[PDB]
Structure 1
Amino acid sequence: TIRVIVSVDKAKFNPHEVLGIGGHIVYQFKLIPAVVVDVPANAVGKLKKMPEVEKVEFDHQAVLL
C-alpha cells in the first residue's frame, strides 16, 4: 500500500473506481484536477491504464531547510 497522486479532470473522475483496485481516496483537491489515493503497489499500473487518468505520481518527500 502506497500513497500516489492521480491527475484527472474533475468532471471525469469517479471516486468509486479506486475501491475496485484495492485503494481508497485520501484527499480530493479543490483547486487542481488531482486526487491523493492509497493503493496496493500493483494498482499503480492499473491507474495509469485508465483513459481519464493523465498522470500518476509517487508521493515525494521534502525536508526542512
Structure 2
Amino acid sequence: TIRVIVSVDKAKFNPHEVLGIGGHIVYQFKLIPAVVVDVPANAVGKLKKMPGVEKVEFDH
C-alpha cells in the first residue's frame, strides 16, 4: 500500500469508488478539491483513469 493525493472534479468524482481498486480514503480536504488515499502500489495506473480524477501525486 502507498499514500497518494488525488486532485478531483468534485462534481464528477466519487470517493466510494476508490474501494473498487483496493484503496481507501484517508482525508478529504475541505478547502481544495483533493483527497488523500491509500492504494496498492500497482493500482496507481487505475486510479489515474478514474471518473473525476484530474491528477495523482505521490506523497513527498
- TM-score normalised by the chain length of structure 1: 0.86
How many residues matched? Answer: 60
- Unpaired runs of 5+ residues, structure 2, are none
Deviates more, 1:37-46 or 1:5-14: 5-14
Runs of 4+ deviating beyond 2 Å: none
Identity within the alignment, %: 98
Hey, what's the Cα distance between the residues in 2 that align with 1:49 and 1:4? 14
Provide the residue aligned with 1:15 in structure 2: 15
Hey, what's the Cα distance between the residues in 2 that align with 1:14 and 1:51? 8
Hey, what's the Cα distance between the residues in 2 that align with 1:51 and 1:10? 10
Question: Deviation of residue 21 (structure 1)?
Answer: 0.4
Larger RCO (CA within 8 A; separation ≥ 6) = 2
Task: Please report the RMSD computed on the Cα atoms of aligned residues, expressed in angstroms.
Answer: 0.9
SS at match of 1:54: strand
- TM-score normalised by the chain length of structure 2: 0.92
Hey, what's the Cα distance between the residues in 1 that align with 2:51 and 2:10? 14
Which structure has the larger Rg over C-alpha atoms? 1
Report the structure, 1 or 2, having the larger helix content: 2
Provide the residue aligned with 1:46 in structure 2: 46
- Unpaired runs of 5+ residues, structure 1, are 61-65
